[PDB]
Amino acid sequence: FERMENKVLDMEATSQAAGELAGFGIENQFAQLEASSGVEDELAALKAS
Amino acid sequence: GLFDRLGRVVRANLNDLVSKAEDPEKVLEQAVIDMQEDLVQLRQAVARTIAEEKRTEQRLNQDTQEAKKWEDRAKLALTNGEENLAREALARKKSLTDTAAAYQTQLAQQ
Amino acid sequence: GLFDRLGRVVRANLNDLVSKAEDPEKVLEQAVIDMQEDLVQLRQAVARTIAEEKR
Amino acid sequence: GLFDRLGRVVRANLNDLVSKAEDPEKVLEQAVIDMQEDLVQLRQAVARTIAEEKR
Amino acid sequence: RTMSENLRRNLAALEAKISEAKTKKNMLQARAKAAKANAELQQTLAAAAAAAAAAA
């Protein structure tokens, strides 16, 4: 069980690998600020109609 | 030593003779391609440090939920009148909160 | 090391010599075709994660 | 004694070298199979105590 | 006969924890297979698409 748990932490380590990939996504993230405001702007127009 | 200095001179002449057979226009952009794979090597290693940082944060969440488990065992021991087992459970809780503070310190550096 | 730098220069010259035999008009749309099969590989793997979620 | 401690260190390094040649995915279920025959050994002995009780 | 009650409970408690370990084994083996596929797919697709697109 203990050695299998050490093997299970290979999946946990793989989760941090996706987190480092996401780090590049944090530099790219400014596009999400314009994307999020845009969907609320047309949604506000749709609600006002 | 004298033969080290003479050796580096003859080796430098041979290295310069090879260096001028390389076309400066073609090899200078090969040097930029090589520098781009150097950045490819750095990004793989940097990402692996992020995984290691998250692994110390996993140990911290395991030992903190293990301390909550032992606190519940201490509560159970006190309702069952077994105060001697409640102290034992509190001693396990203390070693888990003290190692959690070591992992918090490790995580802050990471 | 010095021979790594010299090796990457001679290998880069040979790779550039090959690169200019490829027609830019024809190979640039082969690159878009290749990028379309890259999306074909991603959709198969993504769908397999949905099956794992349902399991 | 000093040579007991040194002996257990060199024996432990050799045992770890062997331990990492074993595939964790395949051997961990062999360990569960082994644990199932351990229960097979216990049930035979327990039943023999019932026979002794009846005697 | 008081020992055979104790042994019959200990035998049932042993197979109960062997049974628990077997269900845990399957779930842990599944997560490891899934995590191996997620990493390969995400990294392969992201790297191949970005590199080919930029060069072309």
Place this chain on the structure above:
Amino acid sequence: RTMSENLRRNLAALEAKISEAKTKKNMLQARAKAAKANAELQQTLAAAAAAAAAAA
């Protein structure tokens, strides 16, 4: 029976410090593996990039 209470506590206290040493062992082995990787990556990337760029 007063000696067996003392021995039963000493046996539990021994395994408690063996248990503590085992958790410490894993955390210390992890830091040593991480530190070995940090040094190699930082030095290799910095030296190779600066030397190649300057020469070219």
